[PDB]
Design an enzyme around this catalytic site. Structure first.
Site, PDB file in Angstrom:
ATOM      1  N   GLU A  40       0.825  -1.209   0.000  1.00 35.79           N
ATOM      2  CA  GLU A  40       0.000   0.000   0.000  1.00 35.79           C
ATOM      3  C   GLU A  40       0.862   1.263   0.000  1.00 35.79           C
ATOM      4  O   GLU A  40       0.560   2.225  -0.710  1.00 35.79           O
ATOM      5  CB  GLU A  40      -0.945   0.012   1.208  1.00 35.79           C
ATOM      6  CG  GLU A  40      -2.044   1.062   1.138  1.00 35.79           C
ATOM      7  CD  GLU A  40      -2.921   0.925  -0.096  1.00 35.79           C
ATOM      8  OE1 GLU A  40      -3.272  -0.215  -0.463  1.00 35.79           O
ATOM      9  OE2 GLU A  40      -3.264   1.964  -0.697  1.00 35.79           O
ATOM     10  N   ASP A  87      10.953   7.714  -1.900  1.00 26.69           N
ATOM     11  CA  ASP A  87      11.017   8.085  -3.314  1.00 26.69           C
ATOM     12  C   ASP A  87      11.770   9.404  -3.468  1.00 26.69           C
ATOM     13  O   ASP A  87      11.963  10.135  -2.494  1.00 26.69           O
ATOM     14  CB  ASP A  87       9.619   8.207  -3.916  1.00 26.69           C
ATOM     15  CG  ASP A  87       8.897   9.451  -3.460  1.00 26.69           C
ATOM     16  OD1 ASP A  87       8.843  10.432  -4.230  1.00 26.69           O
ATOM     17  OD2 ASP A  87       8.427   9.467  -2.315  1.00 26.69           O
ATOM     18  N   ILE A 132      -4.164  12.934   4.349  1.00 23.57           N
ATOM     19  CA  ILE A 132      -3.899  11.663   3.660  1.00 23.57           C
ATOM     20  C   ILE A 132      -3.632  10.531   4.668  1.00 23.57           C
ATOM     21  O   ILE A 132      -4.089   9.403   4.473  1.00 23.57           O
ATOM     22  CB  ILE A 132      -2.714  11.795   2.662  1.00 23.57           C
ATOM     23  CG1 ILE A 132      -3.069  12.768   1.523  1.00 23.57           C
ATOM     24  CG2 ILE A 132      -2.323  10.440   2.072  1.00 23.57           C
ATOM     25  CD1 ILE A 132      -1.868  13.343   0.801  1.00 23.57           C
ATOM     26  N   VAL A 141      -7.435  10.195   7.067  1.00 23.06           N
ATOM     27  CA  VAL A 141      -8.784  10.147   6.479  1.00 23.06           C
ATOM     28  C   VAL A 141      -8.841   9.056   5.410  1.00 23.06           C
ATOM     29  O   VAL A 141      -7.941   8.958   4.575  1.00 23.06           O
ATOM     30  CB  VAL A 141      -9.184  11.501   5.846  1.00 23.06           C
ATOM     31  CG1 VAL A 141     -10.606  11.445   5.289  1.00 23.06           C
ATOM     32  CG2 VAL A 141      -9.043  12.631   6.862  1.00 23.06           C
ATOM     33  N   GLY A 191      -6.765   0.257  -4.376  1.00 26.13           N
ATOM     34  CA  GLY A 191      -5.943   0.625  -3.225  1.00 26.13           C
ATOM     35  C   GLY A 191      -6.762   1.141  -2.053  1.00 26.13           C
ATOM     36  O   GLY A 191      -7.677   1.945  -2.239  1.00 26.13           O
ATOM     37  N   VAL A 192      -6.421   0.686  -0.845  1.00 30.45           N
ATOM     38  CA  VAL A 192      -7.140   1.069   0.388  1.00 30.45           C
ATOM     39  C   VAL A 192      -6.600   2.328   1.097  1.00 30.45           C
ATOM     40  O   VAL A 192      -7.175   2.756   2.100  1.00 30.45           O
ATOM     41  CB  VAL A 192      -7.207  -0.108   1.400  1.00 30.45           C
ATOM     42  CG1 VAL A 192      -7.754  -1.361   0.720  1.00 30.45           C
ATOM     43  CG2 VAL A 192      -5.853  -0.382   2.059  1.00 30.45           C
ATOM     44  N   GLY A 193      -5.523   2.918   0.577  1.00 32.94           N
ATOM     45  CA  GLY A 193      -4.932   4.135   1.144  1.00 32.94           C
ATOM     46  C   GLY A 193      -3.923   3.904   2.258  1.00 32.94           C
ATOM     47  O   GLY A 193      -4.033   2.945   3.027  1.00 32.94           O
ATOM     48  N   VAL A 194      -2.941   4.803   2.345  1.00 30.16           N
ATOM     49  CA  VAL A 194      -1.912   4.773   3.399  1.00 30.16           C
ATOM     50  C   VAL A 194      -2.465   5.045   4.811  1.00 30.16           C
ATOM     51  O   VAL A 194      -1.826   4.691   5.805  1.00 30.16           O
ATOM     52  CB  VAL A 194      -0.752   5.760   3.085  1.00 30.16           C
ATOM     53  CG1 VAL A 194      -1.190   7.213   3.257  1.00 30.16           C
ATOM     54  CG2 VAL A 194       0.479   5.457   3.936  1.00 30.16           C
ATOM     55  N   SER A 195      -3.638   5.676   4.899  1.00 19.98           N
ATOM     56  CA  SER A 195      -4.330   5.865   6.182  1.00 19.98           C
ATOM     57  C   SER A 195      -4.599   4.548   6.921  1.00 19.98           C
ATOM     58  O   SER A 195      -4.574   4.509   8.153  1.00 19.98           O
ATOM     59  CB  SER A 195      -5.648   6.620   5.978  1.00 19.98           C
ATOM     60  OG  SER A 195      -6.528   5.904   5.130  1.00 19.98           O
TER      61      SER A 195
HETATM   62  C1  LIG Z   1       1.138   9.410  -0.430  1.00 17.54           C
HETATM   63  O1  LIG Z   1       2.209   9.548   0.536  1.00 17.54           O
HETATM   64  C2  LIG Z   1       2.699   8.417   1.049  1.00 17.54           C
HETATM   65  O2  LIG Z   1       2.134   7.783   1.903  1.00 17.54           O
HETATM   66  C3  LIG Z   1       3.997   8.024   0.432  1.00 17.54           C
HETATM   67  C4  LIG Z   1       4.759   7.012   1.014  1.00 17.54           C
HETATM   68  C5  LIG Z   1       6.031   6.724   0.549  1.00 17.54           C
HETATM   69  C6  LIG Z   1       6.556   7.436  -0.520  1.00 17.54           C
HETATM   70  O3  LIG Z   1       7.829   7.185  -0.945  1.00 17.54           O
HETATM   71  C7  LIG Z   1       5.794   8.424  -1.131  1.00 17.54           C
HETATM   72  C8  LIG Z   1       4.532   8.721  -0.650  1.00 17.54           C
END
Ligand SMILES: COC(=O)c1ccc(O)cc1
Ligand SMILES: COC(=O)c1ccc(O)cc1
Ligand SMILES: Nc1nc2ccccc2[nH]1
Lengths: 188, 185
Positions: free
Chosen positions: B27, B58, B79, B82, B84-88
Site C-alpha cells: 500500500e 522516493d 492523507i 482520512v 488501493g485502500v490508502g496509506v491511512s
Molecule cells: C502518499 O504519501 C505516502 O504515503 C507516500 C509514502 C512513501 C513514498 O515514498 C511516497 C509517498
C-alpha cells in the site's frame, strides 16, 4: 474518537499531575449516578482494584443494548465510541475497558482497548438483576507521572456527591488494602 | 480511522497468516510509485530494518505540505488520517509511523502512533533534495503469528511492479542479513 486521542488534555484535563486521571473516575461515576436515580433501590459501588483499574457498577435499568438504526451497532457501543465530557472520552484514554450490562433478563459483555471494541456487544448469559458495570484501565501512554488512584480523593468527592443525590447508596472499596466506605444520604 | 481499527482484516487482509502484514508494505509502495513517476530520476527504495520496520523512500516532488482548507491541518496529515485502500489504513495499524517530506527547499517531519499524530507536520531544516519517506512499525497488537517481514514476498511483488512501471527503479534492501535486489526494466 481521534479528536480526543490527538489532544487528550483538552478533554480530560492535565494528564501528568493526576487531576485528569481522577476525572476519569468521576466522569464514570456521574453516569452511574444518573442510572441509579432512575431506579428505586439506587446503589453504586466504586472499586479500586489491585491492578490499578477502577470499576463502577449500578443496579439501575442498564444502558440500552439494541442496535442503533443509523450507526448499525449496539446503542451501548454508540455511547462508548461517539463524542460532562462523556464516557467515550474515558474509553478513548483507557488501554482497556470492560462493559457489562444486565437488562431484559440477559447479561451483555463487551471489551474495548484504547476506545476500539474488540468484538460486538454479546449476550453471554442470563440474570435476574439489572444494571451497568464499567471497569477501565487508564492508558499509561496518556497518563504519566501520577498513574495510581488515591483513595482520599475519591472518598472525599463521593461523600460530597451523596448529599446532592438523595436515596442513592454509594459504596467505595479499595482492594489494595481492604479499605471501605459507605455514603448514603436519605434526606428529602 | 476507528472503522479500520475495529476490523483490520477487512481493510488490509488476514492479520494472522502474514498476508495483511505484507499488504502494508504494498500500500505504501503504490503511493511511492505514483510519486516516483512525475519526478525526475524515478527511484524507490524499500528497506527492511533490523527492528522489523519497513521504510519506503522516493525521489519525487514530495507530497503536499500546505494546510488543507476544509480539514484545517496539513494535506499530508489528511492523507494519513482520512479514508488501493490508502496509506491511512497502514497508519491506523502501525504502532509507529514516521513521515519525512522534502519539498520546496524544506525538510518536514511528523510522527504518528496507532494513527494518531504526535504533533503537527513541522519544518525541521533545509534541503536541496525532494521526495517523501514513510517508515512504519506494524502493530503487534493487530499482526499476530507471522510478525516478521519475509524478504521474498516483497521481492516477488516489487519485481512484478518494475515490469508494469517500466520507467521506475525499485531497490529492495534487507538490513537484517544484508540481502539486496535492484528491479529496473
Ligand atoms: C502518499 O504519501 C505516502 O504515503 C507516500 C509514502 C512513501 C513514498 O515514498 C511516497 C509517498
Ligand atoms: C454512559 O453510562 C456509563 O458509562 C455508565 C458507567 C457505569 C455505570 O455504573 C453506569 C453507566
Ligand atoms: N497501544 C495502543 N495505543 C493505541 C492508541 C489508539 C488505538 C490503538 C492503540 N493501541
Amino acid at each position: 474518537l481521534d479528536a480526543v486521542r490527538k489532544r487528550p488534555g483538552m478533554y480530560i484535563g492535565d494528564t501528568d499531575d493526576g487531576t485528569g486521571l481522577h476525572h476519569m473516575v468521576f466522569e464514570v461515576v456521574d453516569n452511574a449516578i444518573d442510572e441509579a436515580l432512575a431506579g428505586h433501590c439506587k446503589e453504586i459501588i466504586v472499586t479500586i482494584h489491585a491492578d490499578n483499574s477502577v470499576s463502577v457498577q449500578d443496579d439501575g435499568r442498564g444502558i440500552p443494548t439494541g442496535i442503533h438504526p443509523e450507526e448499525g451497532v449496539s446503542a451501548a457501543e454508540v455511547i462508548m465510541t461517539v463524542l460532562g465530557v462523556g464516557v467515550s472520552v474515558v474509553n478513548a484514554l483507557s488501554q482497556k475497558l470492560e462493559l457489562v450490562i444486565q437488562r431484559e433478563g440477559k447479561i451483555h459483555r463487551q471489551i474495548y482497548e484504547h476506545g476500539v471494541p474488540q468484538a460486538p456487544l454479546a449476550v453471554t448469559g442470563e440474570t435476574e438483576k439489572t444494571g451497568t458495570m464499567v471497569r477501565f484501565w487508564p492508558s499509561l501512554e496518556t497518563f504519566t507521572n501520577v498513574t495510581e488512584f488515591e483513595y482520599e480523593i475519591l472518598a472525599k468527592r463521593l461523600r460530597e456527591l451523596s448529599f446532592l443525590n438523595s436515596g442513592v447508596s454509594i459504596r467505595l472499596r479499595d482492594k489494595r488494602d481492604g479499605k471501605e466506605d459507605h455514603f448514603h444520604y436519605e434526606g428529602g
